[PDB]
Amino acid sequence: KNYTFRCLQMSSFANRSWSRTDSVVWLGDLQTHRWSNDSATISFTKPWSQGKLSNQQWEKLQHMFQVYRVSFTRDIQELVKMMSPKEDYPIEIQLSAGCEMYPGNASESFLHVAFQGKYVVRFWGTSWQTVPGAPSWLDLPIKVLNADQGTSATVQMLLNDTCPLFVRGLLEAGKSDLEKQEKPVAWLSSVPSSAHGHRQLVCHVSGFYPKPVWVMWMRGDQEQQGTHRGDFLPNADETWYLQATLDVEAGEEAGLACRVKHSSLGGQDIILYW
């Protein structure tokens, strides 16, 4: 299948003096890197996080990021002074950067920037641009950022060349983690559903990887159309948690089963009878 490599930067600027930048890196829904503000170096969160980079290529790439993090912090502080007093502290800046990998040497790279939680700027082709809906005052920051040909050449290289090359290596090195199968375990429970005579049956499903799963409340062969899947919730061990609720009438509980289909079960569906 297709995998998106996502480098997520969160930068908080409380006032002229105080700031922190924290980064996490995801390949699909698996974390590959962490870079805490407190750490001089990027941390691997998998044995295979260096992908197929030599030690010298990785050291070179890390050194570039180390200079970037310091430079970025000063650049934002200077841009605030430049736009003063239009924009003031506190300021949150987020970057989402990476590449989506497609079959047959195809990929697309992205670098999106959010200011105070709104997507306002991307890197596109050879320059920074504002996106539809961004405020006009960003034209000055963009003009200043776009004067820096050295940064533009580096960003172009990272998006066009480094990202897809690095990620092709990660996919090879991490293949056995990315393709892991972990079995769901299910269990049932019930509560009042703020309706006089109505019960809410809950089917809990936990420990499954990967994410795609099917969970249905059932009377025999009849799929209970009232079934509501909650959100996919993460477990600490890089597996998933999901619950499916059914609002029933007190007494009708008898005859209901919860059925779970998952790739890990090799066709042996879980059926739990209330």
Epitope: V67, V70, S71, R74, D75, E78, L79, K81, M82, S84, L140, K143, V144, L145, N146, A147, D148, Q149, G150, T151
Partner: T-cell receptor
Amino acid sequence: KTQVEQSPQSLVVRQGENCVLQCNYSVTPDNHLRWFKQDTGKGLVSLTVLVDQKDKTSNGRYSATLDKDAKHSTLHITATLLDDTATYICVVGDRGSALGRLHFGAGTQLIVIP
Amino acid sequence: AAVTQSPRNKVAVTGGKVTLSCNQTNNHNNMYWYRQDTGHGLRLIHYSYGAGSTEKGDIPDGYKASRPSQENFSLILELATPSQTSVYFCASGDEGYTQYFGPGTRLLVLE
């Protein structure tokens, strides 16, 4: 003591001799490096700016090198004239935009005996 | 892209008020004040990103900056001291890295 160091501090050459001036820096990042000539009680005249990881420039009798890996630049003056008597100043800009700070060396004093 | 400074030379007394003026007709947003002392490179005192903006540089103590217009950037020594005897350089620039330097001002503060 500082982020930009020039050597020699000063030197005396005879007209027609060549000389080499050195600039070493710790500035990070190093977007570009400029050589200024400053005549006594006058202002800053740009001789050259170097921008590439390994760079070479020329401007008449002036030539310069930059090696960003070594953080080292040389200014070569071929066939010195009386009018080369000046202070030569190395400057490193830490950005390719107005967000940059300039880091100035304290200069090399050249005297050319006519 | 020209930059002018006035005065070009000033003798002042300790405790007196001295204003160093820089004028720039390039329509540059950005202006910068430095001092040059023997044994040092130029050192940044104050800078400005536009009218009404003043920012402290590396050595702002004993100086006030004023940017009343796009054209004019002034360095004010409210209580001049002998330590402010120096050559003062103004520069201007747009979004690019190039700073265009004025010709310098020689200030001597006598006791």
